[PDB]
Amino acid sequence: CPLMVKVLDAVRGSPAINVAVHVFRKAADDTWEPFASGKTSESGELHGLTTEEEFVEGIYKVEIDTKSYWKALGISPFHEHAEVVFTANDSGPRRYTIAALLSPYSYSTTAVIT
Amino acid sequence: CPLMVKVLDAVRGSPAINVAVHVFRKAADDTWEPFASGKTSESGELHGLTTEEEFVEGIYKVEIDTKSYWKALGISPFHEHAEVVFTANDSGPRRYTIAALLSPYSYSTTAVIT
Amino acid sequence: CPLMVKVLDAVRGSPAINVAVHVFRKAADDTWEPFASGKTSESGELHGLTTEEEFVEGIYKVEIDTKSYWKALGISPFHEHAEVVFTANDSGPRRYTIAALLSPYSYSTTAVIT
Amino acid sequence: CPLMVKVLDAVRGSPAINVAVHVFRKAADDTWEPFASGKTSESGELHGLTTEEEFVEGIYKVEIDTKSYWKALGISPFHEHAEVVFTANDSGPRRYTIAALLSPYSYSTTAVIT
Ligand SMILES: Cc1ccc(C(=O)c2cc(O)c(O)c([N+](=O)[O-])c2)cc1
Ligand SMILES: Cc1ccc(C(=O)c2cc(O)c(O)c([N+](=O)[O-])c2)cc1
Numbered sequence: 238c239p240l241m242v243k244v245l246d247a248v249r250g251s252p253a254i255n256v257a258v259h260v261f262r263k264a265a266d267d268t269w270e271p272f273a274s275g276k277t278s279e280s281g282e283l284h285g286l287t288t289e290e291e292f293v294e295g296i297y298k299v300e301i302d303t304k305s306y307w308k309a310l311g312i313s314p315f316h317e318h319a320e321v322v323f324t325a326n327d328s329g330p331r332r333y334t335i336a337a338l339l340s341p342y343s344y345s346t347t348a349v350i351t
Numbered sequence: 352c353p354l355m356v357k358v359l360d361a362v363r364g365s366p367a368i369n370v371a372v373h374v375f376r377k378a379a380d381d382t383w384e385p386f387a388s389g390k391t392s393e394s395g396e397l398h399g400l401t402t403e404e405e406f407v408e409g410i411y412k413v414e415i416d417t418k419s420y421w422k423a424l425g426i427s428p429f430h431e432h433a434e435v436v437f438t439a440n441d442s443g444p445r446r447y448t449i450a451a452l453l454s455p456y457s458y459s460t461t462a463v464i465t
Numbered sequence: 466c467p468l469m470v471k472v473l474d475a476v477r478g479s480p481a482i483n484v485a486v487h488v489f490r491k492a493a494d495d496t497w498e499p500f501a502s503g504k505t506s507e508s509g510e511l512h513g514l515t516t517e518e519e520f521v522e523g524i525y526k527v528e529i530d531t532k533s534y535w536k537a538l539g540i541s542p543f544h545e546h547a548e549v550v551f552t553a554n555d556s557g558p559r560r561y562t563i564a565a566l567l568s569p570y571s572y573s574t575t576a577v578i579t
Numbered sequence: 580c581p582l583m584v585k586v587l588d589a590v591r592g593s594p595a596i597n598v599a600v601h602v603f604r605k606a607a608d609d610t611w612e613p614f615a616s617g618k619t620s621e622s623g624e625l626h627g628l629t630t631e632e633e634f635v636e637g638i639y640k641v642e643i644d645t646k647s648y649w650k651a652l653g654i655s656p657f658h659e660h661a662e663v664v665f666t667a668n669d670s671g672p673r674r675y676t677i678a679a680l681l682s683p684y685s686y687s688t689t690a691v692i693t
């Protein structure tokens with residue numbers, strides 16, 4: 238599995254379960270094409286987004302829809318979502334984990350690449 | 352000054368000087384309109400982005416063009432940029448500082464609201 | 466002012482006001498000597514910790530007592546405090562801002578050096 | 580496995596492999612007793628630190644010796660180490676993952692509790 242997303246909740250100290258994640262790929266157009274999407278599991282992880290055949294060199298944007306999540310825990314947040322834009326597979330295919338740590342007024346994101 | 356952006360470099364432990372910052376506002380269209388832009392100063396700060404007259408309730412996206420910055424320090428980074436999407440002035444006008452801490456494979460962003 | 470500490474609250478999106486901060490310096494003993502302390506102001510900042518005469522090369526530990534702060538906002542946190550250990554003035558005297566961003570189950574710390 | 584530590588490198592976008600981790604527990608003395616220690620594996624993870632029998636309610640400090648790690652990648656860092664102090668098992672036994680994301684001038688730490 239070449240691209241996985243993991244999301245953590247800094248407020249409850251737990252995985253963020255059932256969070257919506259959308260992945261876009263920048264086309265030759267200079268437009269964002271919808272690439273893949275899904276919701277995180279009980280472990281805060283989302284696997285099965287894509288296959289190594291489909292996941293080519295390019296510029297990707299990962300959007301994590303965090304505002305719904307925060308409402309659903311009784312919280313009126315501030316961000317519309319968390320977004321991460323990165324270039325992928327530039328050096329040949331890699332395994333990428335894009336991880337996000339969420340708080341109402343802040344977030345951190347990191348890529349772990351193997 | 353109702354909206355200011357501050358950018359820090361986690362690699363050199365210093366302000367990120369002369370970084371490009373673009374602000375967009377979501378229009379009734381559901382399109383991003385260009386709202387304001389500029390480059391950070393020697394202190395890593397960008398003031399004068401807007402006036403309190405122009406800075407109304409709405410959804411804003413702040414894009415920090417970090418890839419140029421990292422190249423200019425001799426570094427091939429991973430993100431195309433850092434992006435922060437948030438709703439503003441929902442509760443009446445506030446002063447917003449959107450701060451970003453940059454590393455090649457990671458970033459953190461926070462809003463400080465007064 | 467050669468050493469300043471700034472503390473932000475990721476939960477309320479605001480400065481952390483009236484937070485206790487203790488600074489220790491490692492002695493020849495290999496013991497921590499109490500070096501300086503104080504509480505953050507309404508801006509989340511603590512200035513006047515030391516003078517450039519007193520702030521010599523050495524290993525320092527900055528401890529931010531965050532648990533009291535979180536209780537005082539109605540919150541039972543997880544960390545006893547945030548701690549940052551660093552070597553100072555190794556390359557000649559600098560101005561150091563040690564900044565901390567707090568959440569109940571997480572924190573980030575950075576040094577900005579001039 | 581009730582306590583595990585994971586360490587990530589924000590500079591290389593990878594796990595931090597073979598990093599030293601020491602765990603201390605605050606005794607009735609108000610002294611830190613050495614509780615457990617080990618080095619992270621190729622995945623940046625350290626398991627087998629303790630057993631659920633030994634891991635009781637108390638105040639723990641996790642110290643990650645990051646300075647050696649940064650030297651070993653050709654880097655003169657700033658922190659002596661990363662330290663996390665927290666209260667454990669206060670509400671009955673939990674599984675705790677203490678995760679740390681490292682950069683030369685910054686770090687973030689979070690607890691994920693199950
Ligand atoms: C995500 C993040 C975390 C920490 C910092 C940060 O270190 C910082 C430092 C400052 O001197 C300062 O004035 C502010 N601010 O006003 O927000 C932030 C900046 C961004
Ligand atoms: C402070 C911080 C922020 C983000 C990460 C982080 O990126 C991360 C990545 C993982 O694959 C993973 O399994 C976990 N975890 O279990 O906690 C954390 C780690 C630490």
